[PDB]
Subunit: 95 residues, 2 copies
């Protein structure tokens, strides 16, 4: 089965897609705690635009809260709520 040009185009065009995101790229300032899982499923703008001068950026955003196991090594564990940015809408705009 060869993927036809048009649905390659439609499926790849700039839009929100579930992205597995490292928690440390979302909370770089965390120094004490270890997180499990280390990564989370977040709806994020991805894909391509119809000109190389355009770029795929979010226009709408909403926050999402997830249960994450927060570990202080050799000290203890607790499951807590953490908030992450998600993209509801995306647009191809100049760089």
């Amino acid at each position: 089965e060869v993927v036809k040009f048009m649905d390659v185009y439609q499926r790849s065009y700039c839009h929100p897609i579930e992205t597995l995101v490292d928690i440390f790229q979302e909370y770089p300032d965390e120094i004490e705690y270890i997180f499990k899982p280390s990564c989370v499923p977040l709806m994020r703008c991805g894909g391509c635009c119809n000109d190389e001068g355009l770029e795929c950026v979010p226009t709408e955003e909403s926050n999402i809260t997830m249960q994450i196991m927060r570990i202080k090594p050799h000290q203890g564990q607790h499951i807590g709520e953490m908030s992450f940015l998600q993209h509801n809408k995306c647009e191809c705009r100049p760089k």
Copy 2:
């Protein structure tokens, strides 16, 4: 609603996930041509593993064929087949790098 711990874990664990890949990452020597679209949807290994000494790697791979428009600048365009590597199955395996 708040996503349950177990749902986060199952959805984020090392597995094949649809990934938007730039054609120029898969064919870096072909930048004399312009490809529309410039990125394609590929099933690739992604997500996280339950121990520091583990990485998420493919264990089964296959090729997918896609119709892509190839532009030779100021000459013409051609829609032709182009093969891309897909990951069919993934596992957390001891690091090897």
